[PDB]
Amino acid sequence: ILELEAERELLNPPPSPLDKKFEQWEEQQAVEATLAAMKARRS
């Protein structure tokens, strides 16, 4: 199972430090989008 599991992570896009940066980007992107949406209705 340890070998079988390892075989998976190499053929698929492996986790990378950039992925978390993409996550905090996509997350922050929606945070910026969320706050942007809020002010749109206030105006």
Place this chain on the structure above:
Amino acid sequence: ILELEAERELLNPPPSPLDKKFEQWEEQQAVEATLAAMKARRS
């Protein structure tokens, strides 16, 4: 399919830069014809 598709474009008249010139000619030809028709009824 890539080879089959390529076989088609060589036996038929292939796309050429002149074709777009013919298009903007035939298109402009009708644009000139259209505006020519407009003034005909105005007169």
Place this chain on the structure above:
Amino acid sequence: ILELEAERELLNPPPSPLDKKFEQWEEQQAVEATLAAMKARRS
């Protein structure tokens, strides 16, 4: 294995001090390209 491994490095382009210079070139090339790209959008 020591002999087998050695056989590989002679037929292929062997590591050279110039390669690191090429690396810090290609790396610096992209660093210069990266900073060049940044100012392009600022302008």
Place this chain on the structure above:
Amino acid sequence: QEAPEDLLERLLGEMELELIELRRALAQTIATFKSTERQRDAQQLIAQRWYEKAQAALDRGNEQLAREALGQRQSYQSHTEALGKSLGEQRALVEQVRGQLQKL
């Protein structure tokens, strides 16, 4: 020899069997070129993603990610360039053979 006129009709028919052989090989060479073009499109797209991962890094001043993304991009762009270099080479081959076939 056989009836010379019979050979003329028979021979010219044989020659047709070859012109198609060149035609198929000529066309088949096209698939190799355009196939790499999609691969190059994927490679530049993968590079384009990487710059997009660097363009998102361009925003908010996350330069080191624009650095790593562009740094990895150059490897993919070098592959893209390598595919582009191969594509450029194939472009001349297909054109001259078409001129040859058109001439032939």
Place this chain on the structure above:
Amino acid sequence: ERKYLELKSQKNLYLARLKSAIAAQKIEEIAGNLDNASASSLFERIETK
């Protein structure tokens, strides 16, 4: 793996180029019989007649 796939790519391209060469080498046979034998040997025989 990146190296192996590249070789497998140029091989089909290299195989494609030789297929045109295979068709290329043969047309020379056309000229010989259709020009030398036909247009210079059969041709001369009846033309001399």
Place this chain on the structure above:
Amino acid sequence: ERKYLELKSQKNLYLARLKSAIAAQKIEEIAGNLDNASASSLFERIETK
């Protein structure tokens, strides 16, 4: 599961595209007999006559 369903989606789309290709590959057979054989071989025979 989200991955598997996506593959099953593009497959029917991919199968749809090749069905057009199956109909696409065949029309070339139309031109050959209806143009070369008919409009350049049957045609030339009677036209030469």
